Amino acid sequence: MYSMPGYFQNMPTIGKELVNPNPENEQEIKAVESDIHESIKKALDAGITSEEKLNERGQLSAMQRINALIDPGTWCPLNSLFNPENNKFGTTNIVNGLGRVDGKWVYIVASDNKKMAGAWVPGQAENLIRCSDAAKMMHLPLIYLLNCSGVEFPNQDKVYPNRRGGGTPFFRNSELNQLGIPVIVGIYGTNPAGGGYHSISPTILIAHQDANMAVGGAGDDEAAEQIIAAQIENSKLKVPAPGSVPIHYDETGFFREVYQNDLGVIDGIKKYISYLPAYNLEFFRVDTPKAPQLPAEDLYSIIPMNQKRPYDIYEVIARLFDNSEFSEYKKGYGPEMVTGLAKVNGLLVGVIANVQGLLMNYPEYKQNSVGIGGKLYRQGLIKMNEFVTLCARDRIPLIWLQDTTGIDVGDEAEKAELLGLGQSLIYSIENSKLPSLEITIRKASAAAHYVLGGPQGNNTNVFSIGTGACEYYVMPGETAANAMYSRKLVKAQPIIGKMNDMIQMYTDKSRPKYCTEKGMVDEIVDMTEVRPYIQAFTEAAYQNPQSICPMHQMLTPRSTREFETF
Amino acid sequence: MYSMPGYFQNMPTIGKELVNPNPENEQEIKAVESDIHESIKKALDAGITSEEKLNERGQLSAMQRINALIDPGTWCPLNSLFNPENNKFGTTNIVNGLGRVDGKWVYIVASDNKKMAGAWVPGQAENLIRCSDAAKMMHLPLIYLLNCSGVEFPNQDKVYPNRRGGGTPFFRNSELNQLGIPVIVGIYGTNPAGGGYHSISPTILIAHQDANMAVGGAGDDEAAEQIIAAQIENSKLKVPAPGSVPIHYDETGFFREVYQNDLGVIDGIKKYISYLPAYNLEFFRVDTPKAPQLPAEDLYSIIPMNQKRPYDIYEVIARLFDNSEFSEYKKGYGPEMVTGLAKVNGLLVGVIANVQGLLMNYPEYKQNSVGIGGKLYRQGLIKMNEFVTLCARDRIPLIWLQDTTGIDVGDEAEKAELLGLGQSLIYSIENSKLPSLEITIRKASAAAHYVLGGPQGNNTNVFSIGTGACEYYVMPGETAANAMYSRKLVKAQPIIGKMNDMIQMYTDKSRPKYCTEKGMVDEIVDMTEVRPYIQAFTEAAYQNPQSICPMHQMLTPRSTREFETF
Amino acid sequence: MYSMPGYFQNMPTIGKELVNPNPENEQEIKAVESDIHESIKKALDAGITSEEKLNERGQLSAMQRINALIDPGTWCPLNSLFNPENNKFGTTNIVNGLGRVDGKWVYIVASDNKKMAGAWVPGQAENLIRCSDAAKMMHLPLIYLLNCSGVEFPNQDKVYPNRRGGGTPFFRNSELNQLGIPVIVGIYGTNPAGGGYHSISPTILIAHQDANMAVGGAAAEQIIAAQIENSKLKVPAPGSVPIHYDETGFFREVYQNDLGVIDGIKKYISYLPAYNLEFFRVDTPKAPQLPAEDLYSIIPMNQKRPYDIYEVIARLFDNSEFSEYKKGYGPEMVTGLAKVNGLLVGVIANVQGLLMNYPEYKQNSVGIGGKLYRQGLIKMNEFVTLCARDRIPLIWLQDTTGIDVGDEAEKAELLGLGQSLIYSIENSKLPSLEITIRKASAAAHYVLGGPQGNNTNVFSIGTGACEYYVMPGETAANAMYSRKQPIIGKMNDMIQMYTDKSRPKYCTEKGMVDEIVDMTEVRPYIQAFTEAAYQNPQSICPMHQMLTPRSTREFETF
Ligand SMILES: CC(C)(COP(=O)(O)OP(=O)(O)OC[C@H]1O[C@@H](n2cnc3c(N)ncnc32)[C@H](O)[C@@H]1OP(=O)(O)O)[C@@H](O)C(=O)NCCC(=O)NCCSC(=O)CCCC(=O)O
Ligand SMILES: CC(C)(COP(=O)(O)OP(=O)(O)OC[C@H]1O[C@@H](n2cnc3c(N)ncnc32)[C@H](O)[C@@H]1OP(=O)(O)O)[C@@H](O)C(=O)NCCC(=O)NCCSC(=O)CCCC(=O)O
Ligand SMILES: CC(C)(COP(=O)(O)OP(=O)(O)OC[C@H]1O[C@@H](n2cnc3c(N)ncnc32)[C@H](O)[C@@H]1OP(=O)(O)O)[C@@H](O)C(=O)NCCC(=O)NCCSC(=O)CCCC(=O)O
Secondary structure (H helix, E strand, O other), X not given: OOOOHHHHOOOOEOOOOOOOOOHHHHHHHHHHHHHHHHHHHHHHHOOOOOHHHHHHOOOOOHHHHHHHHOOOOOOEEEOOOOOOOOOOOOOOOEEEEEEEEOOEEEXXXXXXXXXXXXXXXXXXXXXHHHHHHHHHHHOOOEEEEEOOOOEOHHHHHHHOOOOOOOOHHHHHHHHHHHOOOOEEEEEOOEEEOHHHHHHHOOOEEEEEOOOEEEOOOOOOHHHHHHHHHHHHHHHHHOOOOOOEHHHHOOOOOOOOEEEOOHHHHHHHHHHHHHHOOOOOHHHHOOOOOOOOOOOHHXXXXXXXXXXOOOOOHHHHHHHHOHHHEOEEOOOOOOOOEEEEEEEEOOEEEEEEEEOOOEEEOOOOXXXXXXXXXXXXXXXXXXXXXXXXXXXXXXXXXXXXXXXXXXXXXXXXXXXOOHHHHHHHHHHHHHHHOOOEEEEEOOEEEOOHHHHOOOOOOOOOEEEEEEOOXXXXXXXXXXXXXXXXXXXXXXXOOHHHHHHHHHHHHHHHOOOHHHHHHHOOOOEEOOHHHHHHHHHHHHHHHOOOOOOOOOHHHXXXXXXXXXXXXX | OOOOHHHHOOOOEOOOOOOOOOHHHHHHHHHHHHHHHHHHHHHHHOOOOOHHHHHHOOOOOHHHHHHHHOOOOOOEEEOOOOOOOOOOOOOOOEEEEEEEEOOEEEEEEEEOOOOOOOOEOOOHHHHHXXXXXXXXXHOOOEEEEEOOOOEOHHHHHHHOOOOOOOOHHHHHHHHHHHOOOOEEEEEOOEEEOHHHHHHHOOOEEEEEOOOEEEOOXXXXXXXXXXXXXXHHHHHHHOOOOOOXXXXXXXXOOOOOEEEOOHHHHHHHHHHHHHHOOOOOHHHHOOOOOOOOOOOHHHHHHHOOOOOOOOOOHHHHHHHHOHHHEOEEOOOOOOOOEEEEEEEEOOEEEEEEEEOOOEEEOOOOOOOOOEEEOOEEOHHHHHHHHHHHHHHHHOOOOEEEEEXXXXXXXXXXXXXXXXXXXXXXXXXXXXXXXXXEEEEEOOEEXXXXXXXXXXXXXXXXXXXXXXXXXXXXXXXXXXXXXXXXXXXXXXXXXXXXXXXXXXXXXXXXXXXXXXXXXXXXXXXXXXXXXXHHHHHHHXXXXXOOOXXXXXXXXXXXXXXXXXXXXX | OOOOHHHHOOOOEOOOOOOOOOHHHHHHHHHHHHHHHHHXXXXXXXOOOOHHHHHHOOOOOHHHHHHHHOOOOOOEEEOOOOOOOOOOOOOOOEEEXXXXXXXXXXXXXXXXXOOOOOOEOOOHHHHHHHHHHHHHHHXXXXXXXXXXXXEOHHHHHHHOOOOOOOOHHHHHHHHHHHOOOOEEEEEOOXXXXXXXXXXXXXXXXXXXXXXXXXXXXXXXXXXXXXXXXXXXXXXXXXXXXXXXXXXXXOOOEEEOOHHHHHHHHHHHHHHOOOOOXXXXXXXXXXXXXXXXXXXXXXXXXXXXXXXXHHHHHHHHOXXXXXXXXXOOOOOOEEEEEEEEOOEEEEEEEEOOOEEOOOOOOOOOOOEEOOEEOHHHHHHHHHHHHHHHHOOOOEEEEEOOOEEOOOHHHHHOOHHHHHHHHHHHHHHHOOXXXXXXXXXXXXXXXXXXXXXXXXOOEEEEEEOOOOEEEOOOHHHHHHHHHOOOOHHXXXXXXXXXXXXXXXXXXXXXXXXXXXXXXXXXXXXXXXXXXXXXXXXXXXXXXXXHHOOHHHHHHHHHHO
């Protein structure tokens, strides 16, 4: 019961059954994966109040609230270890990511009430903007599980002011609303000032019976003593915390609904989520959802931690996409890249990925050359330009699989227009106006990181994820030390020492964990977890898209076919 | 020769001649202004190569290139002291701001070739985004005077990766182009990799004859020696720097034009600027341009450095806007704010500004009260909501003059809807979809900083400026130390000591210079320089606006009139 | 001083010098062209008040006002003979088209004050919407030379009410303003009610000193008493200068005479944003290398004769240069880049004649030029999509008899590929011009950048050799009456009617095509359109970031 099975079903299948496993490699990847999981667990547990203590006082933690909201097994966290300003607890005081609620994907943001009652900490504003941007680009509902005490007083200068500070999300929520994207808030505990605007900015307000939202909270030694007198007098005065339920439900009616406990609040949210517009994804399917035909655990063997080793990218694609099917656009032209159509739970996506290894008699603009997989040449850049443009016309979201060492350099490459072709790709992406996912398989480096659907496209890239085998740098430490200090040897030992410093630093500052802490990549995900994220993304993309191309009116399949025959 | 003189000419005049000058105050302001000018001069001079040395080698500095481009006296720098990451030289290696070129306003970005040949330094990416955002919001041409050596190798992790890093401007330039906003580049010196994409991303490329743009640049002790052999062999090889004029002019034709020297490049830019679409501002005028009727130097007396002193805001408005004329919207309603129409070189703007001092028998929702000027109440918030909405419909840009201590707090204020009214203002602003300017007169604090056209509105606020009398904090240090440590005295000397630490820190981290270094405000401007910036902004706003309301079809003047009569 | 001469300069040249002229054909074309010119002249002269009488009373006619405004030789009229409701005078009481004012292209609408003082007549509302749509799609300034007495009382039911009636332009002017497109009005004579809203809706109002704009203007024996009492009362016509200048200030400026009003308009036009077209040029403007008058020989009036489309393209575009996209693939169509006064346009045009061993989905087949097959439709889909990305406007040259029919064609996806083209055009979001060379027929007329794309096609023009029908009269009579002597008679009626109702003049009267233009006048219209398109475009693609030239090159080499 689908359109055009001749084009969209029984596509060529790709990938081989894994002949030689590699335990050493698998163990190396899993060591990175373990450290990530361990750091996340330690960070989620950190803070002045435990989950156990929270539960005793009648409150749920962020993860408890999240797990009560979502369909089991659908949680795709992002920015778990994001901590650009290096807070001691290791987080930005929010837990965020994608989750599914009774079949509907939503973007979830949860205050960490274990840590200073969910206070604004350095790096949080940035994290929050990455949330609302994702919702914006995907037209996906934004859900706040809110428990926010506002500005951290010692850090006010880092959390209160500026273009992208604590005030920005309030504008971003109005923008979402104006773009037709609903925002739903569960209001827990005390939310004064900063937390008050997080409470009031959403579309729908569901309150805990003890919760509040307010413009402002309650209310030498001779100086020092005076304060404790006023405090204990006000405490015996028993004035209620401003903007409690008797105010914001009974008087202003800004609280739409009030629930007795945390799980009641969740039920309220679930109810309003059920009201939200969403396609039955069947509408956009070209085939019934099918698992890949090769197991994802093979990826622990296929993707080498030895950064000097090539591998076959088709083996990766075969394990990530429905039924191991792939419909390649212009195979043979631009051999440094794979571009083609694939399926994700029956839904069309365009896949763009680096080819690794030696490229015989290539590029064409060089007399007698061998090309390096992971680099970009003329035909690859042109093929991508076309494929992006075609997918954009067809309203087909793009998933980029990056493992790249840059664009070809030198005057032969220059004459081949590579600088202009790279920028043309940037222009093509910006022109596409569709949500896109970027997945760093191993190397994200040079300008290729930018042009290959990089997170530098703030209008199209929703977020980025990386595997345990990934690394981010401008160029390898060795090449960098070279270009920096080679001319300073044309003059001149103190220089040798700081070349080895640079090499060491580039290794340190390019490790997967460091990369996600700085937010270079949003999440480090397990090899068995990459497809889940692709599924989350793709289903979110097609849940309520702002534009449609009927299948019979799509150009990509037609142009792909013609190139194969003509 | 203007529409509706009955509405737009002979408006009420405001302001008094200054009776009592205040030398002490004037001197205090000018001390802040001097320190700013002095820090800017020191920062512009800093770097491994002087202007004198640059000139000897046949090159102009950033400021020389800028001064050769612009009409004399039209330079409005922004982010002069922006240095969020605290680079030693004190800058982000770019000089940026507004400048006029033969009557046309343009946004200007100039590489600082005194410092590591214009290398990407920490904080630069952010600075560059503030540039392209301004051009985007105002539909104003972006001009690059480019001399960029790319990534600073030691700092690569801070300048190369991430959503808002060195790659982002290349996407932002494509966005500008796609929105119909031209980008023009003068290409000087060597521009490899990162600087190559700054070269190629603009609409128009004008090159210095010795300049280049490229995807990549040229080309233990036994290890160490090997490098200097290859280097000196390549140096004697005399291979030209990749992507020089014989390549990018003669072969690729990406350089549109080539000039012999720096001033030739400027002439080329001037020529292409002359091609750009721009209104004769006469088209949008409602009166002939007229100076204010009171001198701006009085502002050194009027605006008190004593943060506890009120002043009359009308005295400020009278000195900033054409002919000291003001057409107030709903005077008497919402007395804590002034909202009304003014003129800037004959062009209509909407002005929103705090009233200072005691407000008798106010707010209305309190039994017997005296209101504090600089705070926001019910009627003020509602009046602003309406005025913003009206100006938005009329396509009249808004200028916000902030001097504020926040929104009224407590359950009487809550019942009066202040939390929802504040957010309604945010929604109203976001809905306006027009470029806006924010000017901090003194206090930018609390949520009022956000709602009063704050820079937290990334779609509407083009940039923000502040006077020498300005200060930024969440709340005063004393109130902050209180709310932080008062409950920790209900338990318990080590606490007293860190309360005085907080008070001191809030004073340090809220000084005008510190605020602009962090980018809380984009520029600290002289009292005599505020009108110039307002003129730059307003004329840029009306140069090529994307939407028009004919004067006879404007609602703001009509509604303003009806309230006065009915 | 241009980007990428390697791509944009010294493109292949096309066309041959004309070997054998054809006087018979030329004369046949010029006979149609003469009849058009003659009908236009008669229509412009028609009406109860002559130009001579207007001049005596101190007033200029529509054409005098237009000719005083525009740079000489830049007038591109549209809808000259548009008269869908068949008014006796032959017009819709407005003169409209493209004109250039001191180098700036603008859209011009002028009230015909020769005819019932510029009253609203049947068909006018539709004509006015075609004006504001053009301005909308090109972001081009709209100029009204206004002299409008409002609703024609006898015809009120046809000019006053409905979604697309006399009130619609007032909403369309607000839309233009909100899209940032300025509207400038010169207010002449009396403009009450309907004409009052034409006066007030624009951005800028310039008034003649005797002019007015108003909400409303100023048994049997009883009426003439009140009338003569009011006439002796000497009450001024409502909303005159002492009101709308002195009191309301809705008139921005007042001039003593018609030419003063024009000067005021010129001044405000000079204020308007416009590129120096040099900014978007890839070469200096160059005439074609073959004369346009050859087209009188090249394009056959004998509708059964093929001709070489390249000969047409060679005579319309700068320096006879053409950079063809995917030559050899989809031979029934020509798609490629060309230049118009140095500016890039994408050209899509039918190939005529026999196509050997084609289409590929059939066995031993000969293809018919002017028809659309699989590869043509796919090539156009790609080329449209590529030009859209590159912000390159499209010019469509139509001479077509439809899309291939039958189950082999169906299996080849032709129905879906045709609609994909429609989708592709709608997706392009750029102003486009459509020129009917000869045949506009079947679904091909729709998909080949037809005027049915109300968001992209600015207007359409046709040559004297053009004709519009669903299908030929013979084929139509067949399909209608084959399944059915009284029947033979009404088959010949149908054939005759299809010939009658498909003549160039009839087509433009009904608005099927907006203007019938002379063979020597096609390039001028292309120049007007292209220069208007690039005057103030809403989106740019830098030359070095364009995909079309790159993809075109790769197909040639790879
Ligand atoms: C640019 C020139 C030719 C200029 O040399 P010059 O004429 O001597 O000029 P000068 O005023 O004496 O300044 C040179 C001096 O300024 C400093 N400097 C220059 N560039 C950098 C940098 N990128 N990072 C850190 N420091 C830099 C160094 O101390 C230079 O000394 P040196 O030239 O080494 O003797 C040269 O210094 C050079 O080649 N520099 C940088 C090497 C390079 O190729 N860098 C590209 C950086 S990687 C990148 O941006 C990648 C982005 C993503 C991608 O596309 O891959
Ligand atoms: C929120 C509550 C009621 C929660 O108290 P609780 O029930 O004891 O909860 P708990 O788990 O024991 O946590 C309290 C403890 O967590 C820490 N903490 C809490 N909030 C902050 C903060 N904002 N900055 C820095 N540290 C904070 C403190 O150590 C708290 O201890 P304390 O309550 O003082 O004994 C209370 O701690 C409180 O009132 N906190 C903050 C005071 C306040 O009113 N803050 C508003 C911050 S200003 C702002 O955000 C302005 C934005 C712009 C504007 O609108 O003006
Ligand atoms: C406009 C002038 C002042 C023209 O001055 P003039 O020197 O007489 O000019 P002329 O060359 O001699 O032309 C007059 C002659 O042209 C014809 N004519 C003029 N206006 C109309 C019309 N509206 N419908 C049908 N026929 C009209 C009539 O035969 C006129 O003869 P008449 O003036 O009756 O002796 C005058 O004819 C006049 O006052 N006409 C009546 C105009 C009028 O009442 N217009 C309102 C039309 S209703 C409407 O548009 C409402 C729309 C909805 C709304 O906004 O309410």
